[PDB]
Amino acid sequence: DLEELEQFAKTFKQRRIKLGFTQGDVGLAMGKLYGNDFSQTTISRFEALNLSFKNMCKLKPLLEKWLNDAE
Q: What separation in angstroms does the CA of 65 have from each of 58, 71?
A: 12, 11
Delimit the domains of the chain by residue range. 1-71
Fold of 1-71: 434 Repressor (Amino-terminal Domain) (1.10.260)
Cα-based angle 55, 57, 61 (whole degrees, multiple of 5): 115
Q: Rg of the chain over CA atoms, in angstroms?
A: 11
Tell me the C-alpha distance between 71 and 69, whole Å: 6
Tell me the C-alpha distance between 31 and 26, whole Å: 8
Tell me the C-alpha distance between 28 and 37, whole Å: 8
Are the C-beta atoms of 12 and 56 separated by less than 8 Å?
Answer: no
This structure was determined by NMR
